């Protein structure tokens, strides 16, 4: 009954930014997770609520795949019960998560001499994000008691900042691609 494109959600030509993470629905296939096992230069591979070795002997109604790109030292924030900039204002995982998180380095593909300014993350926001929520707004952020009136200046800042990836950076500041698999009550081989 066909095999869902686990390859295309793992070797896409370009990934999305963390504040605009890309969601793909996977259903009605014979999920052969051998692709995950065969390629293991994985910086992080952690499954919550299910064992990694049992993925082929269990089924769900549908599977969700979320793809984005972050920096290395923020990879630890993609986990339930974790707090931080990315966890609060960019991407939040519920405390009762039942999926897997995969993250691997992409220095060759995403870094560039002089900086890559196509990857953006949200810096200023007023409240924590609800689990599985995305905010793609670009409205000016008010930091004082005077209305911004849609201009940039003191106490009025643009909410997004670019990572600016370049090869001469440290290990922790290099780009890492992250794919999150969410399962809820697709079958294995």
């Amino acid at each position, epitope marked *: 009954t066909n095999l869902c494109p686990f390859d295309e959600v793992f070797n896409a030509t370009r990934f999305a930014s963390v504040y605009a993470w890309n969601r793909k629905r996977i259903s009605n296939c014979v999920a052969d997770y051998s692709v995950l096992y065969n390629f293991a230069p994985f910086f992080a591979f952690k499954c919550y609520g299910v064992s990694p070795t049992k993925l082929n002997d269990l089924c769900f109604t549908n599977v969700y795949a979320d793809s984005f790109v972050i920096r290395g*030292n*923020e990879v630890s924030q993609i986990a339930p019960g974790q*707090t*931080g*900039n990315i966890a*609060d*204002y960019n991407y939040k995982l519920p405390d009762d998560f039942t999926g897997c998180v995969i993250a691997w380095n992409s220095n060759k593909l995403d870094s560039k001499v002089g900086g890559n300014y196509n990857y953006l993350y949200r*810096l200023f*926001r*007023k*409240s*924590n994000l609800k689990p599985f929520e995305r905010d793609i707004s670009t409205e000016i*952020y*008010q*930091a*004082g*008691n005077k209305p911004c009136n849609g201009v940039a200046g003191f*106490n009025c*800042y643009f909410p997004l*900042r670019s990572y*600016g990836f*370049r090869p*001469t*950076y*440290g*290990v*922790g*500041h290099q780009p890492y691609r992250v794919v999150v698999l969410s399962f809820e009550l697709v079958c294995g081989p």
Partner: antibody, heavy 117, light 108 residues
Framework: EVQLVESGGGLIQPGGSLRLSCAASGIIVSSNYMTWVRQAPGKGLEWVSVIYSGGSTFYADSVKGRFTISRDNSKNTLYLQMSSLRAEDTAVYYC???????????WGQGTTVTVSS | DIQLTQSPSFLSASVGDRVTITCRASQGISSDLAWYQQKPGKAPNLLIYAASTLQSGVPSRFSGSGSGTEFTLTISSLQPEDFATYYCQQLNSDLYTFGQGTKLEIKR
């Protein structure tokens, strides 16, 4: 005008408690990163605590489990509560607004805290 | 945990000289470093952010540059109101680490 004014310093025995207040004008404490730092006499600067505009609080390792950071929107004030004080914590404290990669731009006047016998 | 080091802890110069101060990290910081100035008995002031940009109001004689593990701050034409201590700061994922401090004095 935009400014920060600090208060709550004095003499406290080694083991008491204190509550330092930082009142802001022109800056909303509920919408910015707020930071408490300190400087010992002739010993350079050091970071103590930070609070986000979402309730998340982060503390330094040397001061974990002893200090608390709170925010009051009605009075527009940032409070630092100190408990289980030690003789190494005597210093001048500052409250500042942090913008992350844009740095800490606005600083307070600084209040002295001296602990001894 | 990453630490920053100021190499010229103490340094003396006359009015009109050119001065360069270096701050070196341990592993890697990217282009997020802040240069602050502190006079004795007063609160610190922000001079440089992002290792290259000048804060509004800072005189143009201050200039910073660097990326990776070493950064530098240069003052081209000293004035009598430029003798104080200087610090380098960086965030690095919910931490805040400052430098030891570089003191600038007058020569005689």
């Amino acid at each position: 005008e935009v400014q920060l004014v600090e208060s709550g310093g004095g003499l406290i025995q080694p083991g008491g408690s204190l509550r330092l207040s930082c009142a802001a004008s022109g800056i909303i404490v509920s919408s910015n990163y707020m930071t408490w730092v300190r400087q010992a006499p002739g010993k350079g600067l050091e970071w103590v605590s930070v609070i986000y505009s979402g309730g998340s609080t982060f503390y330094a390792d040397s001061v974990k489990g002893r200090f608390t950071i709170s925010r009051d929107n009605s009075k527009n004030t940032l409070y630092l509560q100190m408990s289980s004080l030690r003789a190494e914590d005597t210093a001048v404290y500052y409250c500042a607004r942090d913008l992350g990669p844009y740095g800490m731009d606005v600083w307070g006047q600084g209040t002295t805290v001296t602990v001894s016998s | 945990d990453i630490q920053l080091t100021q190499s010229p802890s103490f340094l003396s110069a006359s009015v009109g000289d050119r001065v360069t101060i270096t701050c070196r990290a341990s592993q890697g910081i990217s282009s997020d470093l802040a240069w602050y100035q502190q006079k004795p008995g007063k609160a610190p002031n922000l001079l440089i952010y992002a290792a290259s940009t000048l804060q509004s109001g800072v005189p143009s004689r201050f200039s910073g540059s660097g990326s990776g593990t070493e950064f530098t701050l240069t003052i081209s034409s000293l004035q009598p109101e430029d003798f104080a201590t200087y610090y380098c700061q960086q965030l690095n994922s919910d931490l805040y680490t400052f430098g030891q401090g570089t003191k600038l004095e007058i020569k005689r």
